[PDB]
Amino acid sequence: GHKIKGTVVLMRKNVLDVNSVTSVTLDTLTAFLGRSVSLQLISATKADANGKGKLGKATFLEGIITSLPTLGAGQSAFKINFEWDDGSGIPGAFYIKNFMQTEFFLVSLTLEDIPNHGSIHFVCNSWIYNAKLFKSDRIFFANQTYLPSETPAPLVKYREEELHNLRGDGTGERKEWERIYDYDVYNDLGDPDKGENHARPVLGGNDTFPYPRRGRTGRKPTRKDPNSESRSNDVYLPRDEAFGHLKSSDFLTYGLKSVSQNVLPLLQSAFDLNFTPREFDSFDEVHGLYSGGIKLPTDIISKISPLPVLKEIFRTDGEQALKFPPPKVIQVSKSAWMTDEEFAREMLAGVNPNLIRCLKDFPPRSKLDSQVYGDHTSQITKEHLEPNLEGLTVDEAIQNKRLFLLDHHDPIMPYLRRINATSTKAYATRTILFLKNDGTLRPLAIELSLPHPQGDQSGAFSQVFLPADEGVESSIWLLAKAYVVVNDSCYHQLVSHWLNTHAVVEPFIIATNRHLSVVHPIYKLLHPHYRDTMNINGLARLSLVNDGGVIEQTFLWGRYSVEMSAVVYKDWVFTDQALPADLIKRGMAIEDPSCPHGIRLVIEDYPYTVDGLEIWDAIKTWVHEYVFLYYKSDDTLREDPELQACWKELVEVGHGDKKNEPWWPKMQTREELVEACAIIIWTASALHAAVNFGQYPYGGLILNRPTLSRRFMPEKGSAEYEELRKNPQKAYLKTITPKFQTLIDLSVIEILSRHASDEVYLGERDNPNWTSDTRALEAFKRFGNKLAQIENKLSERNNDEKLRNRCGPVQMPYTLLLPSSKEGLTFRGIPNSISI
Ligand SMILES: [Fe+3]
């Protein structure tokens, strides 16, 4: 016959494992070499008795390869030669068995060949556990992308069985070594076994709290409630969805889990004891968090300094102190955050730049049901509006599209009575803003509403606040804006960020692994965009969005945080997530064929939107060229059974509480697929980036983005209005997030706002050689060069002195949508995925 020459690249557990890597020819690789690892090649063109591809001989690893041009940090290569000939046909897949015992990460196999056949490459990227754990061996396919014509006949069944194996069905407790993808509802956030103070409602699968599904973990049900799932310190995810890293430090989720499992208890021990004041007393003390920091006791700066990942996150000085980095919002001016101009600017270029709407009718109305803040309206009046600017009437301002609204009235309202019985004291707020002739936005009125004067039957008890530049009235005004911000923070955290990116995306990763083979073109398109997502979500179920967790302890909606986001999810519409649709729904753009992206913006200098359209367009373009390389006609897409079962399950099961909505694209047209794939990529990439990487740079100062309010507005004559009059900084501080919780927030948002050093960016960036299809490689290249052109374009805008909203009084250039970034707390970079 002949020998096919093989190269296997893999990575040792010790090189990727969090417990080993902390730290980061003696020759360890010898153990991979006797009878330790086998491979068996599978024919793509020659079949057995009943259709299935013929198997070569299981062949063991033969020899260490010291060096190759393409090798790479932490990678080890091994020679292996497969006995094969003309008659065995061409290899298209292979089986690997690891007899070793310790798992390793299989990166790739390269076969240099026989025939006029070129090299066959296989990109595996899978941890291979001990063969005894399996039943049918780990299978990998070559490079070649194939619609489910599935394609080569001898591989058709292997293609289908791999998927059947991945779906696993839906019983059993899920184990570490497994790769089994399925759905469940959010029945695991509570701890009712610890008491019914800790029970939380199940989210999804019901009409009160509909929600996307999450990865099934199959633990045993709680003792006290058989519809909730026992808690574990170890949350399952399909193995391989959990990314390892070569540098200690890039294990960001470790740092998050440790903030709570370790840094928290031992920050109380110097509060719940007493080495540091329990409360801030001036704005100067908040700023010293970035300068000399807080001094702590040696006992406990030794418990929270010699732990993993958290070194390169808090800055020590000599000894005691836990320093924070100065956030960008204060780097040029420490006081600009208080400006009305910066308050309004942040609704266009801030952490949550998503929400503003154009006022179409007046006064603003509520969509709440039968009481009257809400069938009719808001209590802001025409005389409340126009102070120093241009003498248009409200009707004229509206007609000329110059009035805008930030409406945080309806979601918190029905829960206000309850949240206001805790330590939290909160309002439902609306804000009206006006676009000046200078193109910057100005806040004109803030309405602060509470429930049920008497009741919850004709219901709003509201007061309105108007701008003031001097005196007690200007402190009252700063407190009004804070009542707005605390509302905005919470909606940003639970809805714009958690729900709208993390939660909603997860069912797509499940649907995709369950139904599209790794060889499917659509699987390859989308795959980079799911990196580490299920992992970050698995940890947020454990430590972020859970009954005792940091989100419940920090943000306004408290204990009702997650259920409230399920109610918001009642209004979530997939196709309104596309940016252009989002802008039109909010009144922020109008369809217009004259213009650069078919859209004319109201507010031209809206940073998020103007930069985001560029990125949106670039993704849709790439998604179009790709999908039209593979789908010859709309009929070809209607005929794809993997794409159609994937879509069906997504709509019917994954996002199953919305199964009967009318807006779901039917995958009957190639355009509809491009639209859905662009939305998914958008969500996981640029939207998530926009709403996540500005958290520390903007909210790293608690004063600017407080997370909760604890005191009602000082009244009239009272002592607290007199205290306001005397030491307004202290009255400000009494109202917002206390020092303790500020510390935890900062610690968490600091890690969130960082990019790991091994992040993979949109930027044209991908893992290795993911496809042997040269047209797709090329189109992919055109996509990166476009991103590079847009990066220049956007940098040019930040240097355009006429676009004041891009900088503001804070002198903080909007760079969140620049595709490239170096790493760390940067204020930029678009990851392919929701990876933190
Ligand atoms: Fe995130």
Q: Annotated catalytic, 42?
A: no
CA 268 to ligand 1 center in whole angstroms: 27
Nearest Cα neighbor of 332 from 817, 820, 809, 819 is 809
Residue 64 pairs with which residues in a beta bridge?
Answer: 78
Nearest Cα neighbor of 221 from 249, 185, 260 is 185
CA 525 to ligand 1 center in whole angstroms: 21
Question: What's the fold here for domain 336-469?
Answer: Nuclear Transport Factor 2; Chain: A, (3.10.450)
CA 486 to ligand 1 center in whole angstroms: 19
Q: Is the dihedral of CA 123, 127, 132, 133 positive or negative?
A: negative
Measured between alpha carbons, how far is 157 from 142 in angstroms, rounded to an integer? 15
Three-state SS annotation for 339-376: CHHHHHHHHHHCCCCCCCEECCCCCCECCCCCCCCCCC
- Is 836 part of any known ligand binding site? yes
Q: Which two tokens stand for residue 43?
A: 């024919």
Name the burial class of residue 262, with classes exposed (0-12), middle (13-18) and buried (19+) by CB atoms within 10 angstroms of its CB.
middle
Sequence letter at residue 282 = S
Name the burial class of residue 349, with classes exposed (0-12), middle (13-18) and buried (19+) by CB atoms within 10 angstroms of its CB.
buried
Residue 444 near residue 340, CB atoms below 8 Å: no
Residue 251 CB: number of other CB atoms within 10 A? 21
CA 683 to ligand 1 center in whole angstroms: 11
Measured between alpha carbons, how far is 188 from 235 in angstroms, rounded to an integer? 10
Q: Which two tokens stand for residue 293?
A: 């920091």
Q: Annotated catalytic, 597?
A: no
Using DSSP's 3-state secondary structure scheme, residue 113 falls into coil
Residue 612 CB: number of other CB atoms within 10 A? 24
Catalytic residue among 304, 599, 702, 836: 836
Nearest Cα neighbor of 283 from 727, 765, 833 is 727
Measured between alpha carbons, how far is 217 from 220 in angstroms, rounded to an integer? 9
Nearest Cα neighbor of 394 from 430, 357, 432, 348 is 432
Give residue 811's region: left, alpha or beta (phi > 0; psi -120 to 50): left
Breaks in the chain (C–N beyond 2.5 Å) sit after: 24
Measured between alpha carbons, how far is 509 from 529 in angstroms, rounded to an integer? 9
Using DSSP's 3-state secondary structure scheme, residue 39 falls into strand
Resolution (A): 2.0
CA 551 to ligand 1 center in whole angstroms: 13
Residues in the chain: 836
Q: Annotated catalytic, 836?
A: yes
Catalytic residue among 497, 515, 624, 655: 497
Residue 206 CB: number of other CB atoms within 10 A? 13
Sequence letter at residue 58 = A
Nearest Cα neighbor of 452 from 384, 370, 389 is 370
Residue 832 near residue 529, CB atoms below 8 Å: yes
Measured between alpha carbons, how far is 123 from 140 in angstroms, rounded to an integer? 8
Residue 506 near residue 213, CB atoms below 8 Å: yes
Q: Is the dihedral of CA 397, 585, 351, 279 positive or negative?
A: positive
Catalytic residue among 121, 408, 655, 688: 688
Measured between alpha carbons, how far is 122 from 141 in angstroms, rounded to an integer? 6
CA 543 vs CA 195, 359, 522, 713: distances in Å: 18, 39, 33, 33
- What is the 8-class DSSP label of residue 186? B
- What is the 8-class DSSP label of residue 242? S
What's the start-to-end Cα distance of the chain, in Å? 52
For residue 144, the number of C-alpha atoms closer than 13 Å in the C-beta half-sphere is 17
CA 692 to ligand 1 center in whole angstroms: 6
Measured between alpha carbons, how far is 464 from 37 in angstroms, rounded to an integer? 73
Residue 687 near residue 500, CB atoms below 8 Å: yes
Nearest Cα neighbor of 504 from 737, 203, 752 is 203
Residue 104 near residue 11, CB atoms below 8 Å: yes
Superfamily of domain 147-246: Lipoxygenase-1; Domain 2 (4.10.375.10)
CA angle 160/162/167 to nearest 5° reads 95
Residue 28 near residue 15, CB atoms below 8 Å: no
Tell me how many helices (H) and strands (E) the chain has: 25, 23
Which run of H or of E encompasses 46? strand 37-47
Q: Is the dihedral of CA 758, 761, 763, 769 positive or negative?
A: positive
CA 533 to ligand 1 center in whole angstroms: 9
CA angle 331/258/320 to nearest 5° reads 60
Measured between alpha carbons, how far is 633 from 650 in angstroms, rounded to an integer? 23
Measured between alpha carbons, how far is 544 from 535 in angstroms, rounded to an integer? 13
Give pairs for 658-663: CB < 8 Å, separation 24+.
Answer: 658/210, 658/572, 658/574, 661/573, 663/573, 663/574, 663/575
Task: Determine if the peptide bond prior to 363 is cis (ω within 30°).
Answer: yes
Q: Annotated catalytic, 502?
A: yes
CA 312 to ligand 1 center in whole angstroms: 20
Measured between alpha carbons, how far is 647 from 473 in angstroms, rounded to an integer? 56
CA 671 vs CA 255, 570, 666: distances in Å: 42, 26, 10
Q: Which residues contact 201 (CB under 8 A, 6 or more apart)?
A: 190, 209, 563
CA 173 vs CA 235, 267, 406: distances in Å: 11, 36, 45
For 379-409, b/e burial (b = at least 16 CB within 10 A) is: bbeeebbbeebeebebeebbeebbbbbbbbb
CA 498 to ligand 1 center in whole angstroms: 7
- Is 520 part of any known ligand binding site? no
CA 239 to ligand 1 center in whole angstroms: 21
Nearest Cα neighbor of 748 from 737, 758, 760 is 737
Residue 796 CB: number of other CB atoms within 10 A? 9
Match 């003309």 to its residue by tokens.
Answer: 86
CA 662 remoteness from chain centre:
26
Measured between alpha carbons, how far is 351 from 371 in angstroms, rounded to an integer? 33
Sequence letter at residue 66 = T
Q: Which two tokens stand for residue 155?
A: 């591989």
Match 């808090």 to its residue by tokens.
Answer: 314
Nearest Cα neighbor of 643 from 622, 604, 672 is 672
- What is the 8-class DSSP label of residue 155? G
For the chain, give every domain's residue range: 1-146, 147-246, 247-335, 336-469, 470-835
Using DSSP's 3-state secondary structure scheme, residue 727 falls into coil
Measured between alpha carbons, how far is 724 from 710 in angstroms, rounded to an integer? 15
Using DSSP's 3-state secondary structure scheme, residue 251 falls into coil
Q: Which two tokens stand for residue 599?
A: 């859209």
Give 652-703 as a DSSP string. IIITGGGTT-TTSPPTTSHHHHHHHHHHHHHIIIIIHHHHHTTHHHHHSSTT
Residue 148 CB: number of other CB atoms within 10 A? 20
Q: Is the dihedral of CA 506, 508, 514, 517 positive or negative?
A: negative
CA 493 to ligand 1 center in whole angstroms: 9
CA 834 to ligand 1 center in whole angstroms: 6
Sequence letter at residue 283 = F
Residue 175 CB: number of other CB atoms within 10 A? 12
Using DSSP's 3-state secondary structure scheme, residue 530 falls into helix
CATH code for residues 470-835? 1.20.245.10
CA angle 481/486/492 to nearest 5° reads 115
CA 509 vs CA 94, 156, 237, 408, 833: distances in Å: 25, 23, 12, 32, 11
Residue 73 near residue 66, CB atoms below 8 Å: no
Residue 752 CB: number of other CB atoms within 10 A? 17
Give 538-591 as a DSSP string. HHHHHHTSSTT-TTTTTSTTGGGHHHHHHHHHTT--GGGGSHHHHHHHTTSEEE
Residue 6 pairs with which residues in a beta bridge?
Answer: 80, 111
Name the burial class of residue 195, with classes exposed (0-12), middle (13-18) and buried (19+) by CB atoms within 10 angstroms of its CB.
exposed
Catalytic residue among 121, 198, 492, 502: 502
Sequence letter at residue 60 = F
Measured between alpha carbons, how far is 557 from 198 in angstroms, rounded to an integer? 16
Match 């049900």 to its residue by tokens.
Answer: 221
- Is 497 part of any known ligand binding site? yes
Sheet arrangement for strand 428-435: 357-358, 403-408, 428-435, 441-450, 461-465
Residue 356 near residue 404, CB atoms below 8 Å: yes
Q: Annotated catalytic, 164?
A: no
Give residue 67's region: left, alpha or beta (phi > 0; psi -120 to 50): beta
Which run of H or of E encompasses 824? strand 824-825
CA 535 to ligand 1 center in whole angstroms: 12
Residue 70 CB: number of other CB atoms within 10 A? 12
CATH code for residues 247-335? 4.10.372.10
Measured between alpha carbons, how far is 545 from 11 in angstroms, rounded to an integer? 34
- What is the 8-class DSSP label of residue 57? -
Q: Which residues contact 521 (CB under 8 A, 6 or more apart)?
A: 145, 146, 147, 626, 629, 630, 776
Question: What's the fold here for domain 1-146?
Answer: Lipoxygenase-1 (2.60.60)
For 462-477, b/e burial (b = at least 16 CB within 10 A) is: bebbbbeeeebeebbb
Measured between alpha carbons, how far is 643 from 454 in angstroms, rounded to an integer? 55
Measured between alpha carbons, how far is 335 from 301 in angstroms, rounded to an integer? 31
CA 835 to ligand 1 center in whole angstroms: 7
Nearest Cα neighbor of 42 from 8, 80, 90, 85 is 90
Catalytic residue among 98, 143, 187, 692: 692
Measured between alpha carbons, how far is 96 from 111 in angstroms, rounded to an integer? 15
CA 257 vs CA 520, 661, 821: distances in Å: 35, 37, 25
Residue 272 CB: number of other CB atoms within 10 A? 11
Residue 45 CB: number of other CB atoms within 10 A? 15
Measured between alpha carbons, how far is 184 from 779 in angstroms, rounded to an integer? 37
Q: Using only the alpha carbons of the chain, give its radius of gyration.
A: 28
Measured between alpha carbons, how far is 680 from 577 in angstroms, rounded to an integer? 9
| Start-end of H helices in 244-359 | 252-258, 265-268, 283-287, 298-301, 340-349
